[PDB]
């Protein structure tokens, strides 16, 4: 039934599938951080047994150990103990609800009441996490910051990656360098390092801004990865890092960041696995639209833009009256949720001094506000409004101040990055189309469960074969991919990228690849 993690001798065999005895709290924490390295949701309840060293982590009072687990490992369905009937019932109920992917999504979104504070005292919901992070006292906030800093002090985060060899880290530099970003060949561990490469590089360009050591940046990125649901086929940490990487390339080609040795100038090239002796991006030697701190703000927003995404859509949350849709009055439901979580859970604790920075010395617009703006901008229900705000801007008669100009460019760039799958080279674009279809099919299955149009076996989980490397095998596994892509390019992408490239000439290559991909998809519609 449960995975049991123990700091003490006690055994609870009635509920135990597998038991891990840890010598230290630090080692227990490291075990928990590594859980999001996989491609699947944690689907068993976890029981942590506490007692009724120079290490400050290991010597924390129970109240602080408990606070650490509750806050940083909310995503792992943990029951902490230090009543056999209550325990067994609680764990059994949680197991029954966690085993199956469709059950899990229903739990998070509050749309399957009929099946199932936390559910069974163990499983977190979107509203629970949202409420917890909005209502936190200043004292609780500073205590979490203290515990965050303690982990940075005692945990060596690079050691929690599976392959941090010089060759691998160099390969990731060159991967980050390709417009054909091979996201599907990168593990969730590789992806953490990719984020480090991009954010460290951006931080180094900001004048009055202290550089942040490797370990501190890695801790932050582990925390971000932990807010993404690993079992989501599309809206997972890999998507976030992909969108960040798209933004990263846009910003380089706009001159907001300098090019680096590992940057591949030609965006139409496919990925080649290259390496050399460098393990970080090596910079080479009028103003760009976005300055260095605004560039960093855009990158940070792209990183957090889908935090906590439950694997559904605004349409689903609205039509099925999900609690979060009721809170947000059907307006930008998931995006409001992502913005609130990313600011109040992640950045307020991990990087509070970034939030209080302003976009320029003169301006009072904060990076907090800019990040919110950019995240909210990814709502496709508001697509037309930004397209028209671009047309009003381009028509120089109607002018914006500097603050609203920064907001608009930032909004357009993150929008383009978020829907950039059709602008990647064909093979990579197709791989994304496949995983996007998997998530679409899961949403259809969840709707059928709620409508009582299908009876699923909730004792088994959804599993997927590896995404194929070659376009050929992708098209045989699901032909008709082409019609999703034509629909999306015609009705959304072509117009946005054309319109954005008209304003920002350097991104024209995106329009070039959309057309090339469109022609191919048209060719097999025939």
Burial degree of 319 (CB within 10 A; 0-12, 13-18, 19+): middle
Distance of CA 495 to the CA centre of its chain: 26
Please choose which of Mg ion, Zn ion, none residue 403 contacts, taking the beta carbon within 5 to 8 angstroms, the exact cut-off set by kind.
Answer: none
189 touches Mg ion by CB under 5 A = no
Of 145, 96, 142, nearest to 122 by C-alpha is 96
Please choose which of Zn ion, Mg ion, none residue 279 contacts, taking the beta carbon within 5 to 8 angstroms, the exact cut-off set by kind.
Answer: none
306 touches Zn ion by CB under 5 A = yes
3-state secondary structure of 54: coil
User: Could you give the string, one character per residue 251-290, with x where binding to Mg ion holds by CB under 5 A and - elsewhere?
Assistant: ----------------------------------------
Please choose which of Zn ion, Mg ion, none residue 6 contacts, taking the beta carbon within 5 to 8 angstroms, the exact cut-off set by kind.
Answer: none
Of 177, 271, 189, nearest to 238 by C-alpha is 189
Integer Cα distance of 455 and 115 in angstroms: 12
Least gap, CB of 281 to Zn ion (angstroms): 24
Q: Which phi and psi angles does 158 have, rounded to 5°?
A: -60, -30
- Please say which residue, 378 or 431, places its beta carbon nearer to Mg ion: 378
**Residue selected from 189, 242, 306, 439 as contacting Mg ion according to rule CB under 5 A:** 306
Least gap, CB of 391 to Mg ion (angstroms): 24
- Please say which residue, 403 or 439, places its beta carbon nearer to Zn ion: 439
Residue 330 token pair: 């059907």
> Is-contact 37 51, C-beta < 8 A?
no
Residue 479 token pair: 């032909």
How many Cβ atoms from other residues are within 10 Å of residue 86's Cβ? 9
Least gap, CB of 314 to Mg ion (angstroms): 9
- Please say which residue, 306 or 439, places its beta carbon nearer to Mg ion: 306
- Please say which residue, 78 or 325, places its beta carbon nearer to Mg ion: 325
| Contacts of Zn ion in 216-245 (CB under 5 A) | none
Least gap, CB of 380 to Mg ion (angstroms): 8
Integer Cα distance of 104 and 173 in angstroms: 35
- Please say which residue, 180 or 236, places its beta carbon nearer to Mg ion: 236
Q: Is 455 annotated as a binding residue?
A: no
Least gap, CB of 318 to Zn ion (angstroms): 18
Distance of CA 359 to the CA centre of its chain: 24
- Please say which residue, 317 or 450, places its beta carbon nearer to Mg ion: 317
Integer Cα distance of 33 and 26 in angstroms: 11
3-state secondary structure of 186: coil
Please choose which of Mg ion, Zn ion, none residue 226 contacts, taking the beta carbon within 5 to 8 angstroms, the exact cut-off set by kind.
Answer: none
Q: Is 306 annotated as a binding residue?
A: yes
Q: Which stretch, 173-181, 258-266, 302-310, 340-348, contacts Zn ion (CB under 5 A)?
A: 302-310
Least gap, CB of 100 to Mg ion (angstroms): 24
> Is-contact 7 28, C-beta < 8 A?
yes
Residue 146, Ramachandran bin (φ over 0: left; ψ between -120 and 50: alpha; else beta) = alpha
**# of chain residues touching Mg ion (CB under 5 A):** 2
Q: Where are the beta strands (DSSP E) in 410-514?
A: none
Please choose which of Mg ion, Zn ion, none residue 112 contacts, taking the beta carbon within 5 to 8 angstroms, the exact cut-off set by kind.
Answer: none
41 touches Mg ion by CB under 5 A = no
Integer Cα distance of 419 and 415 in angstroms: 6
User: Could you give the string, one character per residue 370-409, with x where binding to Mg ion holds by CB under 5 A and - elsewhere?
Assistant: --------x-------------------------------
| Contacts of Zn ion in 407-426 (CB under 5 A) | 418
Q: Which phi and psi angles does 316 have, rounded to 5°?
A: -65, -45
**# of chain residues touching Zn ion (CB under 5 A):** 2
Least gap, CB of 308 to Zn ion (angstroms): 12
Integer Cα distance of 71 and 43 in angstroms: 19
- Please say which residue, 133 or 378, places its beta carbon nearer to Mg ion: 378
DSSP single-letter state for residue 358: B
- Please say which residue, 262 or 410, places its beta carbon nearer to Mg ion: 410
Cα 136-325-71 angle, rounded to 5 deg: 25
Of 400, 215, 237, 354, nearest to 303 by C-alpha is 237
Residue 138, Ramachandran bin (φ over 0: left; ψ between -120 and 50: alpha; else beta) = alpha
- Please say which residue, 6 or 378, places its beta carbon nearer to Zn ion: 378
Tally DSSP H helices, then E strands, for the chain: 24, 4
Residue 152 to residues 157, 212, 226, 408, 497, Cα–Cα distance (Å): 8, 12, 16, 36, 41
Q: Which stretch, 5-13, 262-270, 303-311, 315-323, contacts Mg ion (CB under 5 A)?
A: 303-311
User: What residues contact 88, with CB distance under 8 A and at least 6 apart?
Assistant: 14, 15
Please choose which of Mg ion, Zn ion, none residue 242 contacts, taking the beta carbon within 5 to 8 angstroms, the exact cut-off set by kind.
Answer: none
Least gap, CB of 234 to Zn ion (angstroms): 8
* Residue least distant from Mg ion (Cβ): 306
- Please say which residue, 90 or 306, places its beta carbon nearer to Mg ion: 306
Q: Is 75 annotated as a binding residue?
A: no
Q: Is 418 annotated as a binding residue?
A: yes
Residues that bind Mg ion (CB under 5 A): 306, 378
Binding site membership for Zn(2+): which residues? 239, 305-306, 418
- Binding-site members for Mg(2+) are 306
Binding interface with Zn ion (CB under 5 A): 306, 418
């Amino acid at each position: 039934m449960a995975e049991v993690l123990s700091l003490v001798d006690l055994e609870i065999p009635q509920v135990t599938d597998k038991y891990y005895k840890f010598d230290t709290f630090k080692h227990l924490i490291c075990h928990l951080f590594k859980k999001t390295s996989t491609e699947t949701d944690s689907n068993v309840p976890i029981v942590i047994i506490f007692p009724t060293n120079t290490s400050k982590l290991d010597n924390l009072p129970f109240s602080d150990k408990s606070l650490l687990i509750q806050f940083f490992f909310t995503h792992l369905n943990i029951l902490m103990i230090q009543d056999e009937g209550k325990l067994y019932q609680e764990i059994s109920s949680a197991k029954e609800l966690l085993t199956n992917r469709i059950s899990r999504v229903g739990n998070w979104t509050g749309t399957t009441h009929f099946r199932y504070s936390k559910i069974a005292g163990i499983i977190p919901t979107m509203t629970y996490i949202l409420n917890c992070n909005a209502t936190r006292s200043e004292i609780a906030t500073n205590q979490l910051i203290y515990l965050y800093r303690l982990m940075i002090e005692e945990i060596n985060f690079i050691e929690l990656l599976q392959d941090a060899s010089t060759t691998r880290l160099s390969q990731l530099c060159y991967a980050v360098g390709h417009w054909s970003f091979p996201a599907h060949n990168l593990s969730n561990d590789d992806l953490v390092y990719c984020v480090y490469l991009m954010i460290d590089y951006a931080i180094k360009q900001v004048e009055g801004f202290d550089n942040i050591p490797l370990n501190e940046l890695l801790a932050f990125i582990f925390i971000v990865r932990d807010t993404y649901k690993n079992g989501n086929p599309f809206h997972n940490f890999r998507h976030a890092v992909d969108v960040l990487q798209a933004c990263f390339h846009f910003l380089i080609r706009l001159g907001s960041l300098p090019k680096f040795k590992q940057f591949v100038e030609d965006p139409k090239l496919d990925y080649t696995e290259v390496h050399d002796k460098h393990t970080v991006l090596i910079a080479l030697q009028e103003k760009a639209s976005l300055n260095p701190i605004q560039t960093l703000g855009l990158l940070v927003a792209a990183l957090g833009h889908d935090v906590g995404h439950p694997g559904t859509t605004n349409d689903f949350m609205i039509k099925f009256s999900a609690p979060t849709a009721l809170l947000y009055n059907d307006r930008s439901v998931l995006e409001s949720y992502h913005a609130s979580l990313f600011i109040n859970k992640v950045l307020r604790i991990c990087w509070p001094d970034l939030l209080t920075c302003t976009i320029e010395e003169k301006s009072e617009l904060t990076i907090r506000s800019l990040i919110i703006s950019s995240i909210l901008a990814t709502d496709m229900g508001e697509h037309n409004e930004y397209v028209n705000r671009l047309k009003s801007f381009k028509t120089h008669n109607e002018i914006l101040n500097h603050d609203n100009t920064v907001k608009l460019i930032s909004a357009l760039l993150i929008k383009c990055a978020d829907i950039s799958n059709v602008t990647r080279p064909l093979r990579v674009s197709a791989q994304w189309a496949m995983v996007l279809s998997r998530e679409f099919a899961e949403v259809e299955l969840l709707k059928s469960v709620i409508k009582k149009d299908i009876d699923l076996d909730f004792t088994k989980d959804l599993t997927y074969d590896d995404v194929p490397h070659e376009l050929r095998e992708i098209l045989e596994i699901q032909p008709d991919i082409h019609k999703g892509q034509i629909f999306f390019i015609n009705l959304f992408a072509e117009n946005l990228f054309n319109s954005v490239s008209d304003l920002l000439p350097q991104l024209q290559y995106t329009c070039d690849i959309i057309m090339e991909n469109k022609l191919f998809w048209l060719e097999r519609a025939k």
